[PDB]
From a paper:
Ribonucleotide reductases (RNRs) catalyze the conversion of ribonucleotides to deoxyribonucleotides, a conserved reaction that is fundamental to DNA-based life. Nearly all aerobic organisms use class I RNRs, which consist of two subunits: α, which contains the catalytic site, and β, which houses a subclass-dependent metal center. Contrary to all other class Ib RNRs studied to-date, the sole RNR of Bacillus subtilis displays class Ia-like activity regulation.
In support of this, we screened 27 diffraction-quality crystals grown with various combinations of ATP, TTP, GDP, and CDP, and only those grown with GDP displayed electron density at the M-site. For example, no density was observed at this site in a 2.95 Å structure of the S-dimer obtained with CDP instead of GDP in the crystallization condition. As ATP has a low affinity for the S-site, the combination of a specificity effector at the S-site and ATP at the I-site favors S-dimer formation.
Author numbering:
A (entry chain B): 7 to 237, 246 to 685, 694 to 700
B (entry chain A): 8 to 269, 275 to 603, 610 to 685, 694 to 700
């Protein structure tokens, strides 16, 4: 092939440097000589849209809200910008993973600008003017909806626009069977399911009269394992659950094969009491949760372990087991070193700053440890009896492109317009066969707006990832994202005239959420960073006082608004570095069918090679500082992968773990998440 | 000590075994042990109050009787000084049935106590019927099934039925529900058999996407883990079964999950209609079908259509997808797999439905864990969460067996079957199982019971009759004809007493009269004079009697959709001092504890011929002769010698099929035995 030959000329050194400028000709040799030759061209858009509608690719019910004169302008608004892919891989990933091919998969029916216009039309819901705003937002590459939303919007044979779910499992056979079903019902829809197993009683607990008969959390994982294989799942366990060790032992590569679940990623929920016990090397006790329920009438998973730990240890009716917390903490380091996960969640770093503890304290997370929301377990009763439908969690995700948002000075416009997009995706998803998910989506209206291209933007403006100026930039940037996200949530609250259920008891309504912003200023401390926000207003401490009073009068429409998820193949389309993380490689080498493909990180030039420092060469404690400073202005979580070298002892890894907990990190794991990325 | 007396049976003296030494061993078991470990009470009231106050017995059923009556019923049980004739007969009762204390260190319940509580539970307040129930069980004329006999009248009660049959529809919603129902029933200690014949095969379409289904095998693996999770909370009872019609495309992959060199704890059954046998006999190629392509074409499930009428049409319809296989190879494959695993249970579907009375409800499509219950069923449709489901008809097995020997000793064929039918009817009306809607609906609508029999070989050998003789079949033909006669009569008597009939009875062959064509034209009085003399003092119904019963049923209807089925007899066969079910005995003495067959002496040693020495073709003749008068099925285990080729095994299958055998397999079923 020809376009491959031009891309590989990057590695052919000329004058002592790589031929980065050879990728522009490789992507040019890709649009010519292939994809332009394989687009079944139409004479007019009307001929184009009618074929796509008559032959049943696009849904008809949403084009029916627009007059055709408007649809042509929206499509004209997309091509109006002469958009050119800067890299070969950036166009390769779109026209192979996103563009709509024909049913016989031999012709390209959709190009960029087509996907964007259809998506924009779907978002606007009939508003021709907003559909053009959505086009410009995505064609300037300021905002990028998640893969399930970007790919499946407006199509027939629709995959759900949500592809990430969190379930609560109650402690009964009835609830386990339902959780098995809901997992398959959601898995077939292309979504990832993460289940909290901490309310299930441990191995060797009682079943009514018989005293030693429960198979524990492990047995339910084997049921869930087969269920996901039939139709990527995850299971979180609180670290004080007795089965925590057997929970971790199903993921050793050397597992007994008869107990090894193979399609379940695992997560571990750790409250502060465990960190304190590990720090002082004294013996710790894990508990049989049903003895807690039998005694206190409440789920151990719903009580404050920081207040109840000593009481459980001293209650003789509570059954306990002695463990070594340092050995268990080192063990979490090895399994993460061996599988990337268990995803670690510092439970009290989430709820210290949680706005909706009146609904519930956050108890677990999703497949990549970014979604952190309240939840209430259901109780699916017998057949003839009514069930109690609680609140599960749905992940409506999307990320801004930090680079292009700064180039266009559109922090307010992009965040507020993206919020409308996520709110529309939430109101259009109506999932059946998963009742607690469905009830929670209409009641909580939670969205997850993220960001990407932090490292690419910093390296393209002469700023190092580990530098104090970088942290100073992120501190101001995400403070503005949080500002306008809250502002848009309150603006939507008055337009619609309602708030998310039980908002009256949130810290948004009581004002506690704004204590930090009305007392502390977040304008950049370095003048070099201040010059980056030229031409756009930095909200002052007086602005936050005004927003707090405005929210106090009209309320919030969303219970949760921001979360920073990983960016899968779409990061290539956006010509962006992955998520808010540092880059792993300056140039990537991938083997796609008898051909070597090279993709230098976006914007990588010979004059910024120093600034594209690879993550494995970085100080992970300084990386923790960066993620902690961003988490200050993210109400949910941030997917954080530690990039570790092989030559690190178990004391070095726990020192990084303990440090992250100290700085207030909510979630962490090392470096399956396909359904739950942007 | 009592073991030393029992083992003295095998110390041969005078050239023979010491069979009368078991009489002394059982005496040495009641003294020096169980009397030393039986909680003595001063009065019956002190006993009954302790058992009720300390929450062993339920109070709500003893509250229907005045204590003067309860004392009389208990007095009626001890009135017959009942003694176990063998050591094992009492050993199995006081270890598997008698109610021990909560700490398992003392025996709170003896025989006559268990019999009376069960009898009191059955009669539901009728003191006089409670005495009839006592006499019936203390004479050992009838024996309720293990789940009914063990758990009756207790607190923290286990279900009186422990055997279920499920239909599975072809959707994810229905598979999830079937997974749940299997676990919901297994935790209750029951065995559940699921019909998988409506599930689409591997490589069929899921809506738009082509070649995307995992087939029945993937559903078997989900059910497999489901039974392993819910094992009755530590009772080692992960007993499930899965049936597949042989014309299902996945039939080969279905059988391959049970090869030792491969899912475990899932028994399999194969439903074979006449068309498949015909194709194999004439060495013609056979076609298996993708069931969903049949559904898309004809709107009906392939499992609900007549393959003998539709086969050629299926083969010719180009919109129906088929696959060619060798039926001769598949029969040999069924022969070896049965020889190595006991199952696949084989069901000759057309031998079941030829004589089925309720084909208007459905043709029988599968069976239970041991191939005895054969009843109509209708698939449910478990829809989405916010939509209402459609509840079809599953199957429940309320089992019980009469003791053929003692029924002949008491000349009580009519009294026992009618009274046992009353007991099984009460079990059906007191079982209200939640988490299994179609099971619950069908039990109230169909009211199907399964009365069996045991001690057929033990009775024949104690009257100088060989199992393989024509006189044995002549006895079996006449005896079970009477069971079927008085069972139908009692079923019609209850229909008139209660004034109602089982749902859609009006369209059964009982109502149209076709059911009685054989009995009103052909006589079933014994042909051999030796056999006729055994029924002295008892009336053998003539063709004129059947005419009267047929007209009586036509006016009052039938209360039970199904009445008779001969299930295996588990550990309770020891308590009844009886040979297992209607099968021949496998060994004269079992092995350390030794148990000689009931009544086995040196003067009838010839008649206690061991089953592996018998001609299985003659055994088929015996089972075919009984099946004439059983409306459901008979659990039939072939007893095969090692020196039998896979071609020898197929000859037995085809013969049994020709002779009208309904179900067959080689030689677990614990939840579905009596
Ligand atoms: C969802 C799913 C179904 N199946 C099987 C199980 C059922 O036997 C069969 C029917 O599934 P259904 O749940 O009925 O699927 P559907 O109703 O969306 O589509 P259709 O119009 O074809 O009915 O497909 C799988 O094998 N894997 C799967 O992931
Ligand atoms: C039925 C059953 C349950 N379990 C486990 C799953 C659940 O986590 C736990 C609770 O089962 P449950 O369905 O709640 O049992 P129960 O309600 O009859 O009794 P209890 O009053 O104790 O709730 O037991 C098994 O491990 N094996 C089994 O067979
Ligand atoms: N970098 C690019 N990104 C996207 N499409 C491109 C690119 N370069 C060329 N094309 C495709 O080729 C067409 C124009 O071809 P070409 O002569 O290479 O470029 P231009 O006319 O912009 O100078 C565009 O309309 C588009 O379909
Ligand atoms: N074979 C047996 N079957 C049943 N009960 C027996 C048997 N042997 C002994 N018993 C029990 O042990 C008690 C003691 O028996 P024993 O005194 O020898 O005979 P009996 O009471 O008939 O004169 C009996 O009353 C009975 O409760
Ligand atoms: Mg419970
Ligand atoms: Mg369907």
């Amino acid at each position: 092939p020809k376009w491959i030959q031009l891309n590989n000329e990057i590695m052919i050194q000329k004058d002592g440097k790589f031929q980065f400028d050879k990728d522009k000709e490789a992507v040019h040799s890709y649009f010519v000589d292939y994809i332009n030759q394989n687009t079944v061209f139409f004479h007019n858009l009307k001929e184009k849209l009618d074929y796509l509608v008559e032959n049943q690719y696009y849904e008809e019910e949403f084009l029916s809200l627009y007059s055709f004169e408007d649809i042509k302008e929206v499509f004209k608004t997309a091509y109006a910008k002469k958009f050119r892919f800067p890299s070969f891989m950036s166009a390769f990933k779109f026209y192979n993973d996103y563009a709509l091919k024909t049913n016989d998969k031999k012709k390209i029916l959709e190009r960029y600008e087509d996907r964007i216009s259809i998506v924009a039309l779907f978002f606007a819901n009939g508003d021709t003017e907003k559909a053009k705003e959505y086009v410009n937002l995505m064609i300037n590459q300021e905002y990028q909806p998640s893969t399930p939303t970007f790919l499946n919007a407006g199509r027939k044979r629709r995959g759900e626009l949500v592809s990430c779910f969190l379930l609560e499992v109650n402690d009964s056979l009835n609830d386990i069977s339902r959780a098995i079903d809901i997992s398959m019902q959601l898995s077939k829809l292309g979504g990832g399911v993460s289940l909290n197993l901490s309310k299930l009683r441990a191995k060797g607990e009682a079943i009514k009269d018989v005293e030693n008969a429960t198979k524990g959390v492990v047995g339910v994982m084997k049921l869930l394992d087969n269920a996901f294989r039939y139709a990527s799942g995850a299971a979180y366990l609180n670290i004080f659950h007795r089965d925590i060790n057997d929970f971790l032992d199903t993921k050793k590569i050397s597992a007994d094969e008869d107990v090894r679940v193979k399609t379940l990623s695992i997560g571990v929920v750790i409250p502060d009491k465990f960190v304190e016990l590990a720090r002082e090397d004294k013996a710790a006790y894990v508990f049989y949760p049903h003895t807690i329920y039998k005694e206190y009438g409440q789920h151990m998973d719903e009580m404050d372990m920081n207040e109840m730990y000593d009481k459980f240890v001293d209650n003789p009716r509570v059954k306990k087991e002695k463990i070594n917390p340092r050995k268990l903490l080192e063990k979490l380091a090895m399994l993460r070193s061996e599988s990337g996960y268990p995803y670690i969640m510092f439970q009290d770093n989430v709820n210290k700053v949680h706005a909706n503890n009146h609904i519930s304290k956050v108890k677990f997370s999703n497949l990549c440890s970014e979604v952190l929301q309240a939840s209430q377990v259901s109780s699916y009763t017998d057949y003839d009896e009514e069930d109690e439908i609680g609140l599960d969690i749905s992940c409506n995700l999307g990320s801004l492109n930090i680079l292009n948002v700064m180039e266009h000075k559109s922090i307010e416009k992009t965040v507020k317009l993206a919020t409308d997009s996520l709110t529309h995706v939430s109101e259009t998803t109506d999932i059946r066969n998963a009742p607690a998910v469905r009830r929670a989506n209409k009641a909580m209206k939670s969205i997850g707006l993220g960001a990407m291209n932090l490292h690419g933007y910093l390296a393209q403006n002469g700023i190092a990832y580990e530098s104090p100026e970088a942290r100073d930039f992120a501190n101001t940037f995400f403070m503005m994202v949080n500002f306008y996200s809250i502002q848009r949530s309150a603006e939507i609250a008055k337009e619609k005239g309602e708030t998310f259920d039980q908002y009256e008891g949130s810290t948004y309504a009581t004002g506690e959420y704004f204590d930090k912003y009305v007392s502390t200023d977040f304008s950049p401390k370095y003048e070099k960073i201040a010059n980056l926000f030229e031409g756009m207003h930095i909200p002052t401490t007086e602005d936050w006082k005004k927003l707090k009073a405005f929210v106090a009068e009209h309320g919030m429409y969303h219970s949760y608004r921001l979360c920073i998820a990983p960016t899968g193949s779409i990061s290539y389309v956006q010509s962006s570095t992955a998520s808010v993380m540092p880059i792993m490689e300056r140039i990537e080498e991938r083997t796609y069918g008898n051909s070597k493909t090279y993709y230098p990180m976006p914007g990588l030039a010979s004059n910024n090679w120093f600034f594209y420092k690879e993550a494995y060469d970085m100080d992970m404690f300084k990386v923790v500082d960066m993620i902690a400073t961003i988490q200050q202005h993210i109400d949910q979580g941030i997917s954080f992968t530690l990039f570790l070298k092989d030559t690190m002892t178990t004391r070095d890894l726990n020192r990084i773990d303990l440090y992250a907990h100290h700085r207030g990190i909510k979630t962490i794991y090392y470096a399956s998440c396909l359904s739950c990325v942007v």
